[PDB]
Symmetry: D5
Subunit: 98 residues, 10 copies
């Protein structure tokens, strides 16, 4: 997993502003990995009760992506600009728009 | 991470009833790992806005543990009995209930 | 494995209250992995004696899940609340109880 | 790394629409990891020229996040809704908008 | 962990006799790793209740070592002979018995 | 592998009593892994010379299991008791006597 | 991934001259891994819009290889010589040159 | 390591042209990792004989980077263009050439 | 570890001559790793009995290196030539023989 | 890979004599892994130019094994004796002499 075994944790000082941006990106990584995991599980579950819960949990992890992204964009103005630039590049090359 | 790179996925058959139990346990593993991760992040985040969201997300992951646990207990009657036995064992050794 | 090579262990101070909650979740992770491992081994073991022991050991690991979860719930009141909430959500969405 | 050693690639059929969503999330994972890597490197680089390139490359990886995100949102309408809902949740709990 | 993600399990045929010996050794590996994990956790746990349960679970994993060992020795006569030889080698070199 | 890259080793003090037990369990893990590796290799080697040596090396690793086990049992009296208890549990459930 | 979880970052000194070389090589590793990942994804994407973006991002990662290579060559004169020597060896053995 | 355990190799088809590019990039990855490894070892080796060999081997691994690079550039014309573009970008941003 | 979980072993055909060379190199890797592990353990073991067995086992693993090396050299004549060439290069650069 | 991310390197003291033996064994491990990697790549490369370079590089890694082995044997006298003992054991069991 991504969490650290407490036996190995010997950090005492709080995150710097830049490390705070990094743990937000890592939190998004964790959520995206969880979404992929549950979507994959749902694909092979012919038990409709298990599939329904897997898909509903995955939906809630997608909201977690939004929460961590809102914090990241607030702390990373460069990401705001480049996110818009990335959207524009996709539009120009493919026509896909929000 | 725990999810598989789709390039490597070649399975076609659906999960067996035994495999359904195993992915539910793996789903609980994933949630418990996420809780530890966000609780650790919150511990070192002095930005109170970031800490607040980390702890609120962690709270929602704890509910996900319950959802998967509920499905597992419904499909694993042995886990229901042994969960009770484990609770009783802790009570007899420590008094915690 | 999940245990640390002692060559790398240099921590000398005890777990904080929050770290105590994290090692209990990690202990549950270890037990859930062991259950999956032994249930998988039993599936492919045509030796009935080996299968019988694998399933009996797995049963005892399921009790270990209960023991660690009893401690976790005692130290994590939020997990108690969210566990019930998770059970209720599955009930509302699937009827499973 | 995240890429597969071609020696292990036996897949011959194209990604399903569900797998397409998954590789887009994995691409975002790869970009976010690269940003963290280069931002961390720049922190410890006293060589001003190396730092400047590290930060400029990281900036360009942030645009890649946007490109993959645009594709993901176009194929994952649920993510569009939950992204909005996630933004609103942060705004309510912290005022960040 | 050591258990396989069911998404990746495509084996259908049962373990051979030689593979049965290998999974028993792997089961012993899993138990020994769990013992080390729980013994390490107990070392840093000031909560006497958590320490008591950690040590009692670890004790039960030591019994699992015996169960898997008994099956392995029953299926691996070479291991029986070499176990004795290993005990004797330690005797001649250290006096430990 | 299981060994540590010396670049990362910064420990100076010797193993405690419990750490000595843990490295003995880790040594057994390494031996059992090596046995499985060489038995697997021998299974697919139709070169009789390679197979013969793989099986002979594997036999000697099984003796290493005994050596590390002897030290572990001498330092871990709880393991002595539970090992006997484990054998009896197998006997009660299957009749096997190893 | 290759980035470190900030929870484990306890380094305070800046990189030495030799370490600067090593992180530039690691940056090239990260870029080459990303190129392989996106090229592999593009191979199995039947969605032409997705494939188009994957290939364009991969192209931009190839430019990042050049950026990190330029810095590395400026700091590693031995790499300059051996790069030329490596090019020459391929010439003599295969005739490939450019 | 990066090499595959032959027990797991079941591929029969030769590499495609795309896969050939990918294994060349992976070969470069292996060489760059070896260079970092030996450079790190040499830094902490007080034995001047060991240091001398480590640096001489690392020098030869740097030539291997050139060999694999030459093949890659010959098969990946896009990499030729972007390599020059990357050089130019560094010149514009830092003055390095 | 280096051994494969039998659940994942789907191979049915024997090793090719090239694969035999590769598993011999992998066997040497396993032995060298074991030597480093036990040599490291012996370093921090003030229990003289434990140290004495660790060093004696490590000695026996060093003989295993020779056994696998003899087979490798017998199947890899190129390695014989390059081994001697490597010895001569060290002699030329350091005088060690 | 086997190299350490410099962000995690905090050792400020040279290798002991025992650690020097360990990094030489680790260097041999790295070379043997590279040989296996390049031998495997050459197996699937029907491009004869790429195959030729893969095999020639692999040949040079085999010389690196010899260089590191020479240093190890010079610093590890037990390995010299046990290497001879291993060769003799193989000759006894198979008749192979190397
Ligand atoms: Fe989540
Ligand atoms: Fe969750
Ligand atoms: Fe257990
Ligand atoms: Fe990118
Ligand atoms: Fe157990
Ligand atoms: Fe051994
Ligand atoms: Fe890039
Ligand atoms: Fe090389
Ligand atoms: Fe050995
Ligand atoms: Fe080399």
């Amino acid at each position: 997993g991504l969490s650290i075994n407490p036996t190995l944790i010997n950090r005492d000082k709080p995150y710097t502003k830049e490390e705070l941006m990094e743990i937000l990106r890592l939190a998004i990584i964790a959520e995206l990995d969880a979404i992929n995991l549950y979507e994959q599980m749902a694909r092979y579950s012919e038990d409709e009760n298990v599939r329904k819960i897997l898909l509903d949990v995955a939906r809630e992890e997608k909201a977690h992506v939004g929460e961590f992204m809102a914090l990241l964009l607030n702390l990373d103005p460069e990401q705001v600009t480049e996110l818009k630039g990335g959207f524009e590049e996709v539009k120009e090359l493919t026509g896909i728009e929000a």
